[PDB]
Design a binder for this molecule. Structure first.
Ligand SMILES: N=C1N[C@H]2[C@H](CS[C@H]2CCCCC(=O)O)N1
Ligand SMILES: N=C1N[C@H]2[C@H](CS[C@H]2CCCCC(=O)O)N1
Ligand SMILES: N=C1N[C@H]2[C@H](CS[C@H]2CCCCC(=O)O)N1
Ligand SMILES: N=C1N[C@H]2[C@H](CS[C@H]2CCCCC(=O)O)N1
Lengths: 123, 121, 123, 121
């Protein structure tokens, strides 16, 4: 449901995610990371699959943040892939991939993988 | 490097995607796949880092496709993270995560992972 | 430290891991999963990097379980990659990959990825 | 299929590994890589599923290598999960996870992921 996803969310590292889910399955917003070579806010864009199922399944979504803004440029990008679960305690559970641009030679070590869980605070 | 990301790309599986790269880091276009509970075109949206570095590195980027359109709804979304490299043969090398919406009981098995290499050939 | 890793551990799904760390960096034991097409115990083998650093870094380790035993055979195998962290509350935090054998055609969907955290109970 | 996993395998990077497959599901041998803080041979231990299925599927397997030997200690371990396929050209297609031991502060960035394809050529 766009509505339930729309809002302010935080994860265990202390990062802030501000998102608006549109009618057409779109996600746009900003991300404020607490870690890495990233200073301030960064623009994020994603999609979410607007017609989930009835049942108590989660809504699948994903989004991307390129770590470049007017203050910094980390030459890397992260994509988060997960599910939105609503209720009194709404959560977004994800797995992410962080890729840094590298030379051919170090490409075998350009991607990190991990997972993040977000808790909603505001709409 | 340069506009170069913009265009039509193909992968091993036969999938095709057409993208437009904007001067400020945005990626927009459509994806049509060859495998899964997918049928037709789907919208894709992503980002790329508009200012790569100048030690022949690739340009980091990522994009998402929710698998729902006017014909099908597979209740899943795929994200591709990787880097673009130009030259006589430009390619995008990625690793992807495909998550399906499940009930909590099946959450442990909701995400698949793989890799895809796209070329304009 | 072999000693700290040796013991009985459980994760959030309710699975049991029994392991012995040997002097030479080896891990051998048994795994009892709570989920999947897996019934009973399965043999596990791994390695752990026996000389970590001084500092409060974790000890890197990994192990494999092939889901075939005398009662079942799921034609799949999982590998867990993580770090052991000791202290009063010793934990093993991992990320795993589950691969099922498939035909060439469905190979794009043969691997699942996720994460597990284990808590020690016994030595 | 059959003994077939046993032998010397090579990957794109130049890495080589020699393995012995036992009738009951065990895999043992040595790994020598071409990249990273690695120098010489390392011991590897894994498992394979000794009874694959009879719809031309691959044989699921996995193995681990801790990167410590009498010469180096990179304080990391790599696990490869994938499947073996025989035929004129047998290959092992894998995805791997490489974890480095960190302090809690750097745990978020302790694991790399990739893919490797091994052949006996
Ligand atoms: N909130 C989170 N921040 C870290 C993880 C995923 S991406 C990462 C921050 C990286 C910052 C930019 C960089 O260092 O490349 N979750
Ligand atoms: N070109 C690719 N197609 C498959 C992989 C990643 S996304 C996937 C197609 C999935 C279609 C929808 C589905 O079956 O869930 N690469
Ligand atoms: N304790 C755990 N069990 C599940 C995860 C990782 S492997 C998985 C169980 C799968 C059982 C066998 C199978 O279904 O293939 N953690
Ligand atoms: N053949 C491969 N070599 C690299 C990847 C996965 S394991 C890795 C070598 C790492 C060596 C030790 C290190 O640098 O940490 N594939």
């Amino acid at each position: 449901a766009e509505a339930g996803i729309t809002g302010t969310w935080y994860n265990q590292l202390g990062s802030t995610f501000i998102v608006t889910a549109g009618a057409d399955g779109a996600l746009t917003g900003t991300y404020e990371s607490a870690v890495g070579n990233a200073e301030s806010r960064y623009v994020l864009t994603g999609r979410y699959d607007s017609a989930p199922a009835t049942d108590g399944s989660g809504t699948a979504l994903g989004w991307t943040v390129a770590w470049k803004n007017n203050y910094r440029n980390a030459h890397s990008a992260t994509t988060w892939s997960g599910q939105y679960v609503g209720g009194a305690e709404a959560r977004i559970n994800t797995q992410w991939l962080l890729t840094s641009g590298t030379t051919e030679a170090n490409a075998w070590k350009s991607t990190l993988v991990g997972h993040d869980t977000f808790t909603k605070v505001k709409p």
